[PDB]
Design a protein around this ligand. Structure first.
Ligand SMILES: O=c1[nH]cnc2c1ncn2[C@@H]1O[C@H](COP(=O)(O)O)[C@@H](O)[C@H]1O
Ligand SMILES: O=c1[nH]cnc2c1ncn2[C@@H]1O[C@H](COP(=O)(O)O)[C@@H](O)[C@H]1O
Ligand SMILES: O=c1[nH]cnc2c1ncn2[C@@H]1O[C@H](COP(=O)(O)O)[C@@H](O)[C@H]1O
Lengths: 425, 201, 81, 426
């Protein structure tokens, strides 16, 4: 009888408290997701259709972590989600009222009486061509093209411009509205001194080297995903998630070897494994991070059905120890019930954790608000948990306390310095 | 009955001294007054509170934090001790041999043990930290084997059997909360609810 | 993986019975709280606002143990307790 | 002999008989008169409960057609404020804009301009609006240490609108005066806010907002019948409240009747609601004292179990209505309303509107802030119920469905045309 060992889960250990110079409110929740991507909180959102879409993937990035757009959708929309996140600036007013060079001046005056002559942007098939204001019609030269302000005398900012730089542009050009174009001079929105003012301030945003929110996106390990990947990589996805129910399969290892030779620089996460051997295998295939979790998911349907699994604590420590030299981080995926489980996961060696159940049902997750019985749910039903930010605070509140108790000021000290005791029921 | 400044405090008759309940097991001080403790937090700004209680004749001072092994606790304890070289001080909470000597060297007269086992145990689950109570007590006790500084088992005491186990693990006394909340003498008012008696806050 | 040890709680142990010259009604429940303070029963009441105020801290002292006035109150009243 | 007045019915005792109908549900007229002069758009009142009605909720409800009643568990100085917040509330008006004073150094102005734009800084010295400075004012180069007072626009050359001015009037003033922002003053030319064309567009459109003759939202507020409430009343009426609620657990008490008679003698034009009663005589008693409407509901409950007094809700309403047939004094169904069906039954008994409490507690706009507990969302001060807008929509969907079934195009027809069946428990 070949029994490799004994294996431990969350309820099996408690973290031992130590000497501490660490106040919880002074703890550093940041951690390296890969050699090149660094999180501000050690949290990933699961690439589940009930959990992560562009909306929630934005909310989490604003909070320090990274969301992973699920793959249960057509490419043209998924690559779109990756853009919706990368290009998201809360200050930009999108879809404002515009006109075309063809618009009858007759039609111009009607809209002016219902939006004011502050300026209607003129577009010819989405390409921004000019703007017509009240000074242009009382000045006189019929259609808008004759009275509009030309492209040459327009003051614009490109999309992705920092906000303070836009604010400077508005003041130094003595304007109160500034249009937002992209690489091809297509209109993307506008900004005023006021909309930049009400833009919510997210100081813990996980942003890229270019201040765009970071976004992940998940694909399967089957054949025929090559076109999806290229689309997302094109869409600017920051890190790619190759998720299979068995990360240690030779086919996974191969498609991973292939994608890596193709994008020598693209950050890739492979999963899932639960062994030292499964971990090096994925790293040698060329992963930038390794996701661990065979068996512990919330709606744990394996084991019972297949008999296979590893209690989560033992799996994480084993993968971590096997990667001790590679600078390739490990992710604890699934089975995270409370904030204590997060702390235990990291102290086992994990560099970040991925959660699903804890997040499904927040406002920002997919689904619609629905009143049922006499309570609020997210109808696609799940229990409405309110805004994501509140949950994250409660959860990180928990983690900070743990680090305060354990004398670990940084995630990395927790991963290396914190000790366990084993316990019974 | 007057006090130090001849201010009236009460009166006594042969009869009222007669109906005075006889408590032969009273914990009294070297002066026959009942002994009292009082608890303060380890934060800054409690210095005035302490001095007030020490002034009020508190017998032993309880410096309670959710992490007795924090350097700030160890410091405020070092400070209070230099200030009142003779004041009996209890520091807590710890759950390790290292946490125990640390508190003793800081100058505690007793050490309170209990990180994780409270009745309404909200740690662990939330923070992942804790120690099953028996192991914690024995570990602290063994670390203090020479100091004549006692250990207290705090929280998680469900029945009287748990008390016995606590002491036999090395504890010199136990501290209880849930077992006592709701007695007549605890805070709260008597309230009839449903069809039963409760202590209403 | 740094697992210091295994750790035990109440439900994990039973106390073994021994030879005994001890009747329960002749047992000495006293114990030293500190080098200088000695209890008659080995019991302290928690410094909880729902548990210990002057009233209960008196009752317990009469019984051999010591109560700990909670701190969730203004000083002028706590020193009073 | 056993003195039993009659047999008495609650909601669960009756069903509404469906009728011939030319009534589509989305075309039903949900409006109805709360007092002889006050007319609601939906027939709904929110309970003056500390868990139900505060300024926040009572606005959301008026925007959707009903009226909230500020609860009385708060100081006179604060209850009067909640009333005022509703009356003057225009979400279209920016209320806390950055201002300056004539004393403000121009140097400090260019600093702020770099942070709010030279769209316009209102100049105020001690609350009185005196002028505004724009970038068009800041041409030519300021000598060392100038102040705004030299370059600003004067008071006479300002284009302003008064508060309570309709919104298209402001658009008209904004367009025809070829300006992008316009200040909103009060009676005394005190700065109250500002309005832009965009701030008018992002103001969500509440076509069924329940407002006064001057377009301000309508609000109610509750007081006790004990002695000593006159000052609170004077404070509330001063705050411009639309309707006053004098709530007692026994409206048929002679002491209630007195404070009403006094309040009525004092404020002859104030719309006053008295409650609660449950009998033909208690309603007639309240009408004589001077009510504009009467609230009906005695144990629709804990009141029934402790005192043994109460009347099932349906017969209680019918009796009051039967007594008020001809007075134009409407009846309000208060309490015991669980679903849209109870609402429908209430009106068909003769009631002109309903008051609800539990149904609203836990809504976003209700008092308390959202708190997560045990994976569920709650209102910490209860089950979080989400936005009021939907609860109303869900509830009125039901009412609308009913009026189609009973062939009643308007509320008053439902109060008069709809028929009942008496039914058993099975
Ligand atoms: O059907 C399934 N079987 C096993 N694991 C799953 C299934 N669906 C999702 N998961 C994983 O479960 C994890 C979420 O676990 P949770 O935090 O406990 O909800 C994610 O990382 C998913 O990849
Ligand atoms: O919020 C809390 N978290 C952890 N421990 C607590 C909390 N509140 C009180 N305690 C402790 O719990 C102990 C009482 O435990 P009990 O005998 O099981 O009720 C006391 O010594 C308190 O110091
Ligand atoms: N409390 C009472 O509760 C009534 C409404 O509560 P509801 O039964 O939850 O609709 C109010 O009219 C009050 O008189």
């Amino acid at each position: 009888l070949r029994i490799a060992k004994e294996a431990l889960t969350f309820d099996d250990v408690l973290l031992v408290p130590a000497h501490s110079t660490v106040l919880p409110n002074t703890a550093d929740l940041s951690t390296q997701l890969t050699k090149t991507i660094r999180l501000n909180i050690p949290m990933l959102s699961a690439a589940m259709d009930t959990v992560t879409e562009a909306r929630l993937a934005i909310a989490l990035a604003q909070e320090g972590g990274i969301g992973f757009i699920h793959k249960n959708m057509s490419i043209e929309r998924q690559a779109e989600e990756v853009r919706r996140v990368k290009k998201h600036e809360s200050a930009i007013v999108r879809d404002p009222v515009t006109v075309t060079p063809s618009t009858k001046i007759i039609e111009l005056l009607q809209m002016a009486r219902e939006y004011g002559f502050s300026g209607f942007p003129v577009v010819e098939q989405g390409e921004l061509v000019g703007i017509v204001t009240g000074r242009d019609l009382r000045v006189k030269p019929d259609t808008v093209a004759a009275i509009m302000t030309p492209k040459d005398k327009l003051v614009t900012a490109r999309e992705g411009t920092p906000l303070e730089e836009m604010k400077a542009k508005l003041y130094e050009n003595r304007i109160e509205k500034m249009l937002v174009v992209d690489e091809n001079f297509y209109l993307r929105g506008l900004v005023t001194f006021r909309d930049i003012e009400k833009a919510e301030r997210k100081p813990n945003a996980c942003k890229d080297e270019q201040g765009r929110l970071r976004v992940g996106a998940a694909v399967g390990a089957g054949a025929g995903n090559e076109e999806r990947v290229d689309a997302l990589v094109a869409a600017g996805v920051d890190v790619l998630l190759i998720d299979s129910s068995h990360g240690h399969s030779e086919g996974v290892l191969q498609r991973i070897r292939e994608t890596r030779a193709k994008y020598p620089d693209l950050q890739i996460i492979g999963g899932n494994v639960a062994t030292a051997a499964g971990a090096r295998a994925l790293a040698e295939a060329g992963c930038s991070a390794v996701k661990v979790g065979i068996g512990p998911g919330s709606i744990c349907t394996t084991r019972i059905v297949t008999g296979v699994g590893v209690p989560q604590i033992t799996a994480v420590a084993d993968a971590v120890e096997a990667l001790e030299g590679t600078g390739i981080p490990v992710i604890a995926d699934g089975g995270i019930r409370f904030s204590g489980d997060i702390a235990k996961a990291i102290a086992a060696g994990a560099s970040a954790v991925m959660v699903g159940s804890m997040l499904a049902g927040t406002e920002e997750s997919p689904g619609e608000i629905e009143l049922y019985q006499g309570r609020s749910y997210k109808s696609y039903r799940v229990a409405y948990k309110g805004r994501l930010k509140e949950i994250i605070h409660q959860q990180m509140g928990g983690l900070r306390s743990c680090m305060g108790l354990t004398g670990c000021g940084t995630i990395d000290e927790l991963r290396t310095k914190a000790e366990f005791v084993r316990i019974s029921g | 009955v007057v006090d130090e400044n001849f201010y009236l405090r009460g009166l006594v008759t042969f009869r009222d001294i007669e109906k005075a309940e006889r408590k032969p097991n009273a914990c009294k001080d070297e002066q026959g007054r009942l002994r009292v403790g009082a608890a303060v937090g380890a934060g800054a700004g409690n210095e005035e509170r302490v001095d007030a209680l020490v002034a009020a004749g508190v017998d032993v001072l309880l410096i309670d934090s959710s992490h007795g092994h924090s350097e700030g606790v160890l410091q405020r304890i070092r400070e209070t001790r230099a200030k009142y070289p003779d004041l009996q001080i209890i520091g807590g909470n710890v759950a390790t041999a290292a946490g125990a000597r640390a508190l003793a060297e800081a100058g505690c007269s007793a050490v309170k043990v209990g990180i994780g086992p409270g009745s309404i145990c909200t740690t662990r689950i939330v923070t992942g930290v804790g120690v099953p109570q028996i192991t914690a007590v024995a570990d602290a006790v063994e670390a203090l084997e020479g100091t004549g500084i006692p250990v207290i088992a705090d929280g998680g005491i469900r029945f009287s059997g748990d008390i016995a186990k606590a002491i036999a693990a090395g504890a010199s006394a136990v501290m209880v909360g849930s077992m006592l909340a709701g007695t007549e003498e605890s805070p709260g008012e008597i309230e009839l609810y449903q069809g039963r008696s409760y202590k209403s806050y």
